[PDB]
Symmetry: D5
Subunit: 194 residues, 10 copies
Amino acid sequence: HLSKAKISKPAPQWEGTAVINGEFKELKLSDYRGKYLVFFFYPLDFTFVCPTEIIAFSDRVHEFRAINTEVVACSVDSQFTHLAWIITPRKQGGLGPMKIPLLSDLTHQISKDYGVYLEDQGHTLRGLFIIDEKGVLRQITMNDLPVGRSVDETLRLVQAFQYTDKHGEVCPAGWKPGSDTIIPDPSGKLKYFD
Amino acid sequence: LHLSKAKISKPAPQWEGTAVINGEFKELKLSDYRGKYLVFFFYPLDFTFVCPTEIIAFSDRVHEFRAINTEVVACSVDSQFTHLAWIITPRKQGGLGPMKIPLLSDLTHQISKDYGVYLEDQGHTLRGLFIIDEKGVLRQITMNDLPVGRSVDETLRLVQAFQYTDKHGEVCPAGWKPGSDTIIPDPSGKLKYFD
Amino acid sequence: HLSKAKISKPAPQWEGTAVINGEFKELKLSDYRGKYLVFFFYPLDFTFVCPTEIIAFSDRVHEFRAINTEVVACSVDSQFTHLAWIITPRKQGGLGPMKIPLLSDLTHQISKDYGVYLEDQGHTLRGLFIIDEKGVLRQITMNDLPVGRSVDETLRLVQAFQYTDKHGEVCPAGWKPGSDTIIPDPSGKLKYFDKM
Amino acid sequence: HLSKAKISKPAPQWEGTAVINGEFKELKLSDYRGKYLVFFFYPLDFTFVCPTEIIAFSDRVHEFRAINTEVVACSVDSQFTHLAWIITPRKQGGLGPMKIPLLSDLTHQISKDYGVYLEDQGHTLRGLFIIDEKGVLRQITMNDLPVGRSVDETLRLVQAFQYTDKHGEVCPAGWKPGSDTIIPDPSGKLKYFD
Amino acid sequence: LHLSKAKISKPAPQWEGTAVINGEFKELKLSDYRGKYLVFFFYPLDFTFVCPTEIIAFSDRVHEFRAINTEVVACSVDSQFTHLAWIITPRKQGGLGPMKIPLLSDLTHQISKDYGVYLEDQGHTLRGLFIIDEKGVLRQITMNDLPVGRSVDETLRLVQAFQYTDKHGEVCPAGWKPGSDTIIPDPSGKLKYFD
Amino acid sequence: HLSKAKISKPAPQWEGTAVINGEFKELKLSDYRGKYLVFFFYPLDFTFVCPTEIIAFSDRVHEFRAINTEVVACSVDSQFTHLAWIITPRKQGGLGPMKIPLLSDLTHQISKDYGVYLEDQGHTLRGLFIIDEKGVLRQITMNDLPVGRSVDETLRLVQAFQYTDKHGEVCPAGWKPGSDTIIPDPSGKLKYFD
Amino acid sequence: HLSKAKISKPAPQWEGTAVINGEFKELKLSDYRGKYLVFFFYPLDFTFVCPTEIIAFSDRVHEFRAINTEVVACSVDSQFTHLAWIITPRKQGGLGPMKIPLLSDLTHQISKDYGVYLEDQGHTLRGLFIIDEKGVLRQITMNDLPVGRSVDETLRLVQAFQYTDKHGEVCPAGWKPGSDTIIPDPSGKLKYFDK
Amino acid sequence: HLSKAKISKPAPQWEGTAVINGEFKELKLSDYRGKYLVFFFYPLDFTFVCPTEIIAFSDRVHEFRAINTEVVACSVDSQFTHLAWIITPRKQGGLGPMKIPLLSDLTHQISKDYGVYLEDQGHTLRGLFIIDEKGVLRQITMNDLPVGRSVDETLRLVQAFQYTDKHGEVCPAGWKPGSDTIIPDPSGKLKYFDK
Amino acid sequence: HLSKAKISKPAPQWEGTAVINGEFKELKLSDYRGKYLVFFFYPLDFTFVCPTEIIAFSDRVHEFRAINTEVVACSVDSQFTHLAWIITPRKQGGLGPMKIPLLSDLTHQISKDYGVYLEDQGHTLRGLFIIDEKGVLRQITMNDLPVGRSVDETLRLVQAFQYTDKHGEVCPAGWKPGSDTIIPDPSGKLKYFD
Amino acid sequence: HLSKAKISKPAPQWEGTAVINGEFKELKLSDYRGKYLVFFFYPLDFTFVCPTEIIAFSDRVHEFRAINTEVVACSVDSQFTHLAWIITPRKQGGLGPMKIPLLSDLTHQISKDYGVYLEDQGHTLRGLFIIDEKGVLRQITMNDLPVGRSVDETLRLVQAFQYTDKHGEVCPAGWKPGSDTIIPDPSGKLKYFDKM
């Protein structure tokens, strides 16, 4: 397994054509500097788990935008196929109008750079990446094909990284806003453990 | 360039080492878990901060995983002697107390490198978790930077979902929990969920 | 430019999933042994020239089947996108029901083997290949993106190759059924050239 | 199979001795910049299908010249053999006086650069190339030895490429002058399809 | 084949790392000791058996070395957090108690490999000790297999001898201690010792 | 620095000519199986620190023989030079009659195998090796040229390795026969530490 | 300069299509075992010096066949061009009906094996080779493009090699049948030099 | 077969010691710029065919010098052996006083550059080279050991190259001065072929 | 400097054509097994020092033959040149009738194998080799071009090597038949030195 | 067999510690520029043929110094062993006081450069080298272990090289001072050969 994606290092640069509000637009990772970004890959347009994940993030995108965070989805399908899918009604396994960009990776170069490409199948697995305002990679989540991801877990992780960025204390297992934190010092730590 | 032997949908890399199990040193192997699901996770360092909260959370809930034919094993680069010293230290001083899950030692760093979780510049791992099925095949990978702990709730949800899809041949939507709707993976069959 | 496709050599083998009468089926080049095959690539589902080419071959495939010849189309799109496009009406730029298989090449392996893959774009150009009953490649036609191919010219070529296979004389520029042919021999050829 | 000829990229440069109006002259691809060029190879002088193709193009060269297009033929034979074949009468399998250049590729360099050389036989197959005013390669047609090409199809393709260069619409399967075209965007395309 | 950058009569390989010094974490470097002799020693593992007896022996006698412009530094592959936990553990439980010498951490294994003391199969060092002079040049190497501890008495004798020969230009016979006879290193001069 | 000498692995094999009781004899490391061996190198015959070390071990060799241990000395000098040195009286910086073998390493191969050869000088430094009855290397001591070794420290180390071999307890810093030992177990250890 | 042609070693094998009595036939070097062979290359059909060399050999081939010797000509031109040139009358620079085969080397492999190919021009220079009954190469003659060879000198050479093969005396500069020869011995040679 | 000798390209440079009028002198190929050169190798001094070739050229060298052409002979023998052979009378198989230089190639480098060295024997075969005024190689003739070359054929060739250099017509098979030539043009050639 | 000739190892094999009693014969090093051989190279036939050395050995060959020893001379010159030089009278710098073989090394292989070939000059220097009955090389003498060797010294060395082969004593500097020898051991040597 | 020693080329440079009049001194080959040098290797200190050779050259070194020539001996032994051997009386197989330097080659570098090192034994054979005033190597003599060299032959060779350097004629087999020489020219040589 080879990849350019390394936690605590700058996330690999990407550029491509995206569908945004029904139109074709050029989009780059660098466009997102100054904000957190949830960047996620899904296997294939017109399939099964995939539309449930894209719909989940689009319907709840306001929750991420309230905390200076954007969301971008990506597959190996072309931009013409993405638009056809957006126009397909939800009842027929389509998406309907979308509030997040759908990026196209026809050459497979972006998938390969992020280490999510399946050479035997010709598409990606379910891989999600959390990137900070400075462009640095903080988190990687990857699922086998039959099991979808969680919007709730994704929000929890974004909130935790922002908190530790700001305060310099660290977040225990299962942390949510309001939970106890730890001072990362051999003496300071006892204020939590006591 | 990041290198690893860990690939989703392929056999998880074999490992062998010394673990602390009920206060005793014992040889332990990945192959010992064939027939059961395994949550296998790495943590940075004994006697630190987020690490003990994660080990305690899993130990205190390990019965929930065992009820569904699933085991849990923890691993760091620390020696077996340091693991035992940490188990003897009380929770109020940042120790673990008695543990219900094995603590595996990776002194040589070979296991960490095989799983793609070793940080060359630091000499220890990041927070990496792996879900492995009863046939030894890798199903899931979760990796966090140092300051943020993982979730026992989410790990359980994922084990439940993989067990469901293995048994039923339907697939699980975003946010699935036991009792939630599922999809037939066919262009016509799918409409029973979507319509 | 690298490729495995060479005229007068065996055509490169391929295997993949195709949509045939609305269902997903495994298809291989060896399945067509004993027949002529017109095997063609097109750039992208839900685009512009591509649907006109597939429709033209679909609506006229009976002409080819009457002469022991089949037709197969291929793009880099998935089989799920192929089916979505077949379901879309012709008036919205869809295909409607199809009489020819649509093969999927998601991995790009088939495209690269045939020398038709565009690295910078991530899809194929317009490349058509004529393969005989023994699996030998006889003809290659490749067009840049904005210009479609011709069913009339493709039919003429299949007729000409079948004629030379059977009779052992050769077909002059612009030959159609009924036109004069040449004996491939230094004196025998002069029978044809007498009419000049 | 190795070649330098790639569609949508500049056609490989060539230079050599050609027979033009019964005389030996130096000729280069760059000589044709500013016009379209039909550049074609044939197997061997004094053979069978070959003279029928060269005759067909020569007798119709005025049709291409009327639309700013030139025609050049090429084989591995020497310039002395080319002239001998031109002097030979049509009734004896010769060419008679010619209106297009016949280029000699004695070293095989031009044939190898264009991907048309047969190593086992020592001559080319039937390969034709359509090149635009800017020197970019637009079309490749290749036939096995026993079947000749078509002047009618070649003319259609030159017409189609000139139309799309000028108007920015695209040409459907079987397009001829006067036929319907397509606007290449997701909503504009409906003018044609509906 | 054994490989190392440590060579007697050549500059000792540079090192940098985090050490525990008076209960605090501090960056420490070999170059910090220029101008003084240094006894630099590796030990296998924190919370083990012979190891604490060696660290305690040197700490409890470090004043004898400091009286002759010589310092002492200890090193293992353990982390700085484990070193501090071990310092806090009482001597009666196999701990160290308060320490007067730095404990250097080599988590990455780079320092151990540079000095030729790393055991690949085990993931920790053997018992290796190095004597380095005021100009940074290596003068002595002592290495023991795991079951047998080293001697503070012998280490002191060797420091004293090297300081004597540096200053006097005579050389030290087998078993030399301060006040013992020495030799002029010349074919004629030598007879003042031998006759 | 390269060497074949590794603690806890078999000591590198050696063979050569030695002076034993005034005569030339062939001697091999394998001759010593079943006994402990102190094998030591010294820089040069007719020098300064070197004869003091050889005399020290020879005069005290009975102490090692009482505990199933032999002693062998080695330098790069020839066997003819070794014999001339043995015949030289102690008062002239010679050795007098010897009770331990002096091995010759003229080719430098043994020195190189044990990692004690000085490439700039053409002789060894002061390197001593302790090897067990099974031929396994237990201890390495190496000194720069101006400072001699200790017979007393060498005896202490031999006694400690024999004790741990027999009993399976381990020896603390500064151990001598009669001193306390440790059971190498996380619970057993407390019998010593208490 | 690369070649497989070496005097006193076996001549490189060749096979190809030739025009023989106006028909196309496969022809090989080994077809000529048992006879001497004059094997010669010329630049190009329908040129200037070339037809004069080929005609001179065809017209006089009976002089070679009388002494168990055959003659073959070769160029890079196709067999279809060879036949066209043979059908062309001599007055128009053609050959007319031929008595010796014309071999075609379209792939250039035969020419490169014999060391006569001109890479810049794409054809051969004027190279001639005399090959004995056992297939061994005896003589090489090579001319630049504007100067023709000699049937008379070629005949003299075949005669000389046939004489020395049979008698074991050697042939002085300019030998023709009936001329004086030399016994190749340091004493026997003096008979010749007496004159 | 390796060589630097290529027809229609510059002849390989050479320098060495030669015997000229019974004295030793350094000689170079570039000394002959402005004139044609016949440059020939022979196997061995004191042998059989060799003295006959060298004598024939020395005796007739005025015929070459009349048309701005020189002649040089070369073998692997030393300059001391060359002079001994020249001092030896013709009746005893020697040469007598010479009018052309004898070049020595003791190192074998000149012979290998010209492609005439026989590795199994340690000497050259019978190789002759015609080089024009600009230093360009025009002709190569190579014979196996038992058959001598021809001064008459060599003269014919020098005449033919000199004619074509000056006039730009070409020379048919067997041309001698006064014979018919060809204009090298597809129309102009028909004048010659009319006959 | 590269060579195959090494003292105390078997002399490199050689074969070639030699002049023996006015006739050309094949000769090999193995032909001399069972006798000592003086094998020597000289620069060039018809030169200056060379004939004086070949004459000196030929006129004295009976002295070597009386002690089971043969003599062979060699240069890069051909066998035909060798015979011409033999026929040439001594007053003219020739050899006259010879009693020793003259070997030809036209290919230079023998000279290169023995380390005596001069690459810049194309001939050998003055190299002499003494080889025993078992084919082992015992002695090498090499002179620059202007200075000849000595038959008296060569004879002395053959005598010395034969003596030490037979008796097992060793020959001091300047030994001749009748001189004192040495027993090669540390106590036995005193018979000579005292 | 590899070596840097080549006749008619510059002798390989060397530097080392030698015993000269009982003291240790640094010595280099370049120190002898302007003089002839006889540079010889011997196997081992405290052995048998070796002392006889060193003594013979030491006792006769005045003959060489009278003709602008020096002598230097070398073995793989240390300078401390060299001194011990010089101190040992001749009657016990020692050298006694020496008039020539004894060079030490502990690293074996000098021996390998001169092509005289025996790999299996760890010491040199008996190799002698004659070097001129300009540093050019003129002569090599090498003997197997049991047979000593000759001072008489060495002297003759130095005399012959000095003669040819000065006068430009060459020395026949067995030349000694007073013997006839040859003009190196094809006719001039016949002056010498007239006496035959």
